[PDB]
Amino acid sequence: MMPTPVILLKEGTDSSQGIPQLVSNISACQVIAEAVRTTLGPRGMDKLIVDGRGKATISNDGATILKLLDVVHPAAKTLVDIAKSQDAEVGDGTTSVTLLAAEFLKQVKPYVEEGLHPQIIIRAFRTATQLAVNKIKEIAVTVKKADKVEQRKLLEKCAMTALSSKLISQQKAFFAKMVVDAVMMLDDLLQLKMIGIKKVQGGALEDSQLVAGVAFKKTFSYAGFEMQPKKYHNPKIALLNVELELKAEKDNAEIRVHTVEDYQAIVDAEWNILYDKLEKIHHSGAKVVSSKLPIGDVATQYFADRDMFCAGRVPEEDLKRTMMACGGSIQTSVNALSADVLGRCQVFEETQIGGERYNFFTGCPKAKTCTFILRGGAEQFMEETERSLHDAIMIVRRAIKNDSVVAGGGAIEMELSKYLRDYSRTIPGKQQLLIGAYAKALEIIPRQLCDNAGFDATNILNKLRARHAQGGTWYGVDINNEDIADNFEAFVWEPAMVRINALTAASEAACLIVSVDETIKNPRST
Amino acid sequence: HRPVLVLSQNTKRESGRKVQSGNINAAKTIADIIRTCLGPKSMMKML
Amino acid sequence: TLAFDEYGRPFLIIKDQDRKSRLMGLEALKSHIMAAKAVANTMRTSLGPNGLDKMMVDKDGDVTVTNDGATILSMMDVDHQIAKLMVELSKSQDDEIGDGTTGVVVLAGALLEEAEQLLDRGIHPIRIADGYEQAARVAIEHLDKISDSVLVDIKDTEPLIQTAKTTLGSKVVNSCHRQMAEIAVNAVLTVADMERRDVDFELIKVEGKVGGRLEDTKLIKGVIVDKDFSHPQMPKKVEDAKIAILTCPFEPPKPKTKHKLDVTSVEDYKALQKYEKEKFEEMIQQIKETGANLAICQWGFDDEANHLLLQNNLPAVRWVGGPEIELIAIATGGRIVPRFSELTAEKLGFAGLVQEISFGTTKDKMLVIEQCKNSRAVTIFIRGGNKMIIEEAKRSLHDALCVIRNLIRDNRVVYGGGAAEISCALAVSQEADKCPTLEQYAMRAFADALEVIPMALSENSGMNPIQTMTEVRARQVKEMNPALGIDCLHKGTNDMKQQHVIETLIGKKQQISLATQMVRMILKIDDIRKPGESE
Amino acid sequence: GMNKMVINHLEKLFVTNDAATILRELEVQHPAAKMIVMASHMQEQEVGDG
Amino acid sequence: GPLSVFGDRSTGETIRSQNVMAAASIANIVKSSLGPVGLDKMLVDDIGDVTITNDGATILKLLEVEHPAAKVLCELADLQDKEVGDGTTSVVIIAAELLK
Amino acid sequence: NIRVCKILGSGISSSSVLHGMVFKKETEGDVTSVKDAKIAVYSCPFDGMITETKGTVLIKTAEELMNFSKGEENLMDAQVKAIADTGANVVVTGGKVADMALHYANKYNIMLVRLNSKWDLRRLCKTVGATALPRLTPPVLEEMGHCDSVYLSEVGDTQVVVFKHEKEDGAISTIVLRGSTDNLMDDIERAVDDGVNTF
């Protein structure tokens, strides 16, 4: 009843200010965190979310959950945007980052209600963040056994760990070995665009295969492609961007004829031009001819009578991979074809995996790409499998170039809280209530790694506190025995960068929330 | 139609500077009604 | 609370939060298992030789009565995200193997049903899912222990015909129990590639025409198309066919590009009239010079061509479709010729008697080819007294063709009639107690679930499942485990070796593996976020 | 100072403390208040601060 | 499947969270009027009757609450007036914090 | 002459200054590593040239039809060769690239960059010391610019094109800002502008 001037300042704008607005902003962050609280750890559960199309997605990755929640609260969006970054920078840093960032605010929530201006909180968050990050660098371990079985084992252990919290139980040795070896097929850019994953329905997880070469799905064909046998033991591959239709035109020409002699000559010329191109393709050995452009009926029969195979309408993404897989080049014009532009492989066959036809290439020793073929009993089943392969490849790619790893589980988070407590007990004044709050939030990881599957959370956390304060700092939470286990000796390792970036992103998220005092929402929304 | 779980349905609250200055502004507004009914040169009001 | 904060202000997190629903607990898990019971209760009614049929009424009013689970489950209007996955399970089995369209739903349902007690016992939902893997490995390993075959795919096709009889015995075509079993064997073995063990599905075409009876279904060593001779007085019988396959219309050649012929003088007008007449004569004589006596054209004919076809005694048909001229050229050993001027005798097809068949009062004029030369394609011609039995017959022969293909892919077989399922349940039970660390309850639940098949078979066979199961399971232990199953009429004894109940090894291996994986991906869920009303 | 979270008439969220960009998103209609806002543009154009 | 009760049933962490909010919504009323540095409230009913007060008893007697968890704190204040006669502000503040 | 490039990633400590220009386009080719970096910029599309009045091709006989297409290939080859013989390493256009233009770009090992923004083309010419030519690729002798290292890199899961100047540094600067949220990067940019204006 108060803002009732004779002339309004703006229009109809909502505005909140002060302590209830900060509490509301923190509360929104606590609620959105609920979407991932049960997804952490090897015994996390999956979520089923239905979109407006009626299609469900089943997943447990934070980078897929938070994007489907239809968040509108200005503050809750903060914990989503930081997931967008961690998806690129880290990969594993999804559920753990969201939960820690939310806890950073919960620990100070009971204090921000009664004074304690955010200006002092933000400075303490920055101090504690720098302390925690430096501590990781001082404890991470490396190896000196590069280009030996010791590095292969490191990468395999990184892959088997990366495959945790997926729809994977006994297939870790099956997928992990192929992920490590698939990446070693790449050049020294390790560009992920060189690894394809394709889903073929039918069969179990263990029936998947890693193909050194490429394959295409045999798209729209014409009458005559039931012919051309699919048995080749040493084919050459021509990748062309040439039109092989009779109706190919320049779209701007008109052929004006004044006599019958030229009438027939044009009719014959149109057929002769097509045959000229086909004869130039021949005499090359390119028994396999592929193009992104149509290949018409006349060419299909020409190739059949010449004992050649062709297939058109191949997407550019597969032609580029085919070029890199077969070791050749892609030529647009046929007027300059030679043996020096063709690809080569040993086996080219059309198989029937899952009932659908697939044309596989293999046998090229200079294959810079590969394709992993997934088999499964459902669309969603394979879709979740594909996601598990993308993360495992990402962790292995990074582990090859950065061998600095830390203990998994909550082992590092307990040591970080130990270091911060040792710091805080040497600092006088208000900082004791702020550095400690940062440290206390760090236990959300070993807590949730127990709450989602029992393990007597109260006492097993007390054990971690007793052990880390007296002995080693690599102790975490086992899954098989409901007690403490040494993650270092068990080789439960994660790249050091996962936690370093998690601390940075979680700290910045907190500073974005506590630094806001006012929210202004324009009324114009149509 | 499932309602929202609330307390004190259809009530309003105003607190803070909007009240501390609000109530004073209300007193300032009403005070002017008879501002011209003080001195010996007052004018008549027709109500 | 949502839409109300402790300060009296609205509290809005997600768009239209008041129209959402979330319930996690154990209720998401019980809801998933309960919904699966509704699915299992449907398919259990069509299992076994007495399986009952379903009538499916489509959205447009069309009605078809079928037994094939692929046709039953694909026509559902169920708006439940997990029940939809139960349909995908039957699809994966149909695509890979093509047999167990009923079995994988009944088995997967039993695993979900038996799991219900395990949650109530306090066993972690994921530990249940993992426990099924430990038991499933036992059943799979023993499934491959008992297997033998004498099929060579040369002449000793007796067990191959028997396999087709086992599959067809569940369908509505038992009036042709033998006839269709023999058709299916002959259809595949005459086109299958013994070198790679591959069978190309495009080499067996299935056609049909309403009328007659199932007993009139024949296997034709050749192709059947819609015959329509362009000249109505053209003789309808060719004794020795020299077939020209042509993809060019019988009209004067035209360019593909913009032409716009300029005619100025009368000499130009009249001269063109002569030249065009000659084109009609040349295009026909170019066929006769090759010795051809039957032309089959993708395109139509001009009126001028039909007269020339008559005078040159050159029968031909018109507007034969893409896949029809493709199959004809392959079946007859010929090649498709682009143009008239490219015709040569070397590309002609060779075939025997060519005739068209008239059916009753109709004008269908269907092709029959009597003789062929080393054809690698066959056509099945299905008859029947109504539209429904013919469409079901198409699926009945499809299943018979699929299990033949499966034996070609892998010639290892097992004994059916429930013998494999009961034996697996007994094997898992024996190892379920080696060792009862945590998973004792889960491994026993798996063994019990395996029995859902001989129990449902017993119910549909009219037997009490307790009186039947207790006898067979005892007999398989008191003596060296015979291939002892169940049946409705008992046929004397239940020795599967004497009843010749044959099923494929790779079929059951997929049924166990695919059912187990489907159960896992729907147990490990505890949160469903489905939207409600639009506004 | 403290940050504002401002959502403009296009439903775009701007989080800052820089008044030069906050004032550009506040849809002020009062016929006189506009003048003291517009003056801030000449300050930003001339020196870019203050 | 579900209970055939014609109303609305909530279990688990739903009610365990709501009772904390409802209790807080009551303590938030009187927390601002504790001590000589507190400030008074003006309560205006629907028809225009204006009451000035700062005591926890009068305020909570006049203000209507709906959640069953909030009525508990209102009754607590009423008991303090009967047994002691004064101090009726800290019994709501302290009791709400015990729940939190 | 100071630009800001926002790339999502880690916190502010990963920001830096780059002496050159960064674009967020792809190459559409396989010449991504350039060391000699003689840069030719054009305003015409890399697909040939047509008339402005109307244009229509008239054919009267068969020899005129059959040999027509060959003329297009001969012209396109010579047009790309004209700049290949002069040492062209990079060709930058605002328009599209023809399939034959890609054929010849790979033949002569010349990298293509498409910049749809007119201001990006103008700034690039002023940065590298080049003149934009409105016509098809002549044997350009003196209008080419020079960089020290031209390459592509995947930064923050975005592939970018970098024109790096180590010798001719004081031409343009790009300040690359990293952060965990768009809100952080937008606010930091404002701080950058205050510094540029204060100077």
Curated annotation (Swiss-Prot), chain B:
<feature type="binding site">
    <location>
        <position position="39"/>
    </location>
    <ligand>
        <name>ATP</name>
    </ligand>
</feature>
<comment type="subunit">
    <text>Component of the chaperonin-containing T-complex (TRiC), a hexadecamer composed of two identical back-to-back stacked rings enclosing a protein folding chamber. Each ring is made up of eight different subunits: TCP1/CCT1, CCT2, CCT3, CCT4, CCT5, CCT6A/CCT6, CCT7, CCT8. Interacts with PACRG. Interacts with DNAAF4. Interacts with DLEC1.</text>
</comment>
<feature type="modified residue" description="Phosphoserine">
    <location>
        <position position="8"/>
    </location>
</feature>
<comment type="similarity">
    <text>Belongs to the TCP-1 chaperonin family.</text>
</comment>
<protein>
    <recommendedName>
        <fullName>T-complex protein 1 subunit gamma</fullName>
    </recommendedName>
</protein>
<feature type="cross-link" description="Glycyl lysine isopeptide (Lys-Gly) (interchain with G-Cter in SUMO2)">
    <location>
        <position position="12"/>
    </location>
</feature>
<comment type="function">
    <text>Component of the chaperonin-containing T-complex (TRiC), a molecular chaperone complex that assists the folding of actin, tubulin and other proteins upon ATP hydrolysis. The TRiC complex mediates the folding of WRAP53/TCAB1, thereby regulating telomere maintenance. As part of the TRiC complex may play a role in the assembly of BBSome, a complex involved in ciliogenesis regulating transports vesicles to the cilia.</text>
</comment>
<feature type="region of interest" description="Disordered">
    <location>
        <begin position="1"/>
        <end position="21"/>
    </location>
</feature>
<feature type="binding site">
    <location>
        <position position="39"/>
    </location>
    <ligand>
        <name>ADP</name>
    </ligand>
</feature>
UniProtKB/Swiss-Prot annotation, chain C:
<keyword id="KW-0143">Chaperone</keyword>
<dbReference type="GO" id="GO:0051082">
    <property type="term" value="F:unfolded protein binding"/>
</dbReference>
<feature type="cross-link" description="Glycyl lysine isopeptide (Lys-Gly) (interchain with G-Cter in SUMO2)">
    <location>
        <position position="15"/>
    </location>
</feature>
<dbReference type="InterPro" id="IPR002194">
    <property type="entry name" value="Chaperonin_TCP-1_CS"/>
</dbReference>
<protein>
    <recommendedName>
        <fullName>T-complex protein 1 subunit epsilon</fullName>
        <ecNumber>3.6.1.-</ecNumber>
    </recommendedName>
</protein>
<dbReference type="GO" id="GO:0005813">
    <property type="term" value="C:centrosome"/>
</dbReference>
<keyword id="KW-0963">Cytoplasm</keyword>
<dbReference type="InterPro" id="IPR002423">
    <property type="entry name" value="Cpn60/GroEL/TCP-1"/>
</dbReference>
<keyword id="KW-0378">Hydrolase</keyword>
<keyword id="KW-1017">Isopeptide bond</keyword>
<feature type="binding site">
    <location>
        <position position="417"/>
    </location>
    <ligand>
        <name>ATP</name>
    </ligand>
</feature>
<feature type="binding site">
    <location>
        <position position="101"/>
    </location>
    <ligand>
        <name>ATP</name>
    </ligand>
</feature>
From Swiss-Prot, chain D:
<feature type="binding site">
    <location>
        <position position="49"/>
    </location>
    <ligand>
        <name>Mg(2+)</name>
    </ligand>
</feature>
<comment type="subunit">
    <text>Component of the chaperonin-containing T-complex (TRiC), a hexadecamer composed of two identical back-to-back stacked rings enclosing a protein folding chamber. Each ring is made up of eight different subunits: TCP1/CCT1, CCT2, CCT3, CCT4, CCT5, CCT6A/CCT6, CCT7, CCT8. Interacts with PACRG. Interacts with DNAAF4. Interacts with synaptic plasticity regulator PANTS.</text>
</comment>
<comment type="function">
    <text>Component of the chaperonin-containing T-complex (TRiC), a molecular chaperone complex that assists the folding of actin, tubulin and other proteins upon ATP hydrolysis. The TRiC complex mediates the folding of WRAP53/TCAB1, thereby regulating telomere maintenance. As part of the TRiC complex may play a role in the assembly of BBSome, a complex involved in ciliogenesis regulating transports vesicles to the cilia.</text>
</comment>
<protein>
    <recommendedName>
        <fullName>T-complex protein 1 subunit theta</fullName>
    </recommendedName>
</protein>
<feature type="binding site">
    <location>
        <position position="50"/>
    </location>
    <ligand>
        <name>ADP</name>
    </ligand>
</feature>
<feature type="binding site">
    <location>
        <position position="50"/>
    </location>
    <ligand>
        <name>ATP</name>
    </ligand>
</feature>
<comment type="similarity">
    <text>Belongs to the TCP-1 chaperonin family.</text>
</comment>
From Swiss-Prot, chain E:
<feature type="binding site">
    <location>
        <position position="35"/>
    </location>
    <ligand>
        <name>ADP</name>
    </ligand>
</feature>
<comment type="subunit">
    <text>Component of the chaperonin-containing T-complex (TRiC), a hexadecamer composed of two identical back-to-back stacked rings enclosing a protein folding chamber. Each ring is made up of eight different subunits: TCP1/CCT1, CCT2, CCT3, CCT4, CCT5, CCT6A/CCT6, CCT7, CCT8. Interacts with PACRG. Interacts with GBA1. Interacts with DLEC1.</text>
</comment>
<feature type="binding site">
    <location>
        <position position="86"/>
    </location>
    <ligand>
        <name>Mg(2+)</name>
    </ligand>
</feature>
<feature type="binding site">
    <location>
        <position position="88"/>
    </location>
    <ligand>
        <name>ATP</name>
    </ligand>
</feature>
<comment type="similarity">
    <text>Belongs to the TCP-1 chaperonin family.</text>
</comment>
<feature type="modified residue" description="Phosphoserine">
    <location>
        <position position="4"/>
    </location>
</feature>
<feature type="binding site">
    <location>
        <position position="89"/>
    </location>
    <ligand>
        <name>ADP</name>
    </ligand>
</feature>
<feature type="binding site">
    <location>
        <position position="90"/>
    </location>
    <ligand>
        <name>ADP</name>
    </ligand>
</feature>
<comment type="function">
    <text>Component of the chaperonin-containing T-complex (TRiC), a molecular chaperone complex that assists the folding of actin, tubulin and other proteins upon ATP hydrolysis. The TRiC complex mediates the folding of WRAP53/TCAB1, thereby regulating telomere maintenance. As part of the TRiC complex may play a role in the assembly of BBSome, a complex involved in ciliogenesis regulating transports vesicles to the cilia.</text>
</comment>
<feature type="binding site">
    <location>
        <position position="35"/>
    </location>
    <ligand>
        <name>ATP</name>
    </ligand>
</feature>
<feature type="binding site">
    <location>
        <position position="89"/>
    </location>
    <ligand>
        <name>ATP</name>
    </ligand>
</feature>
<feature type="binding site">
    <location>
        <position position="87"/>
    </location>
    <ligand>
        <name>ATP</name>
    </ligand>
</feature>
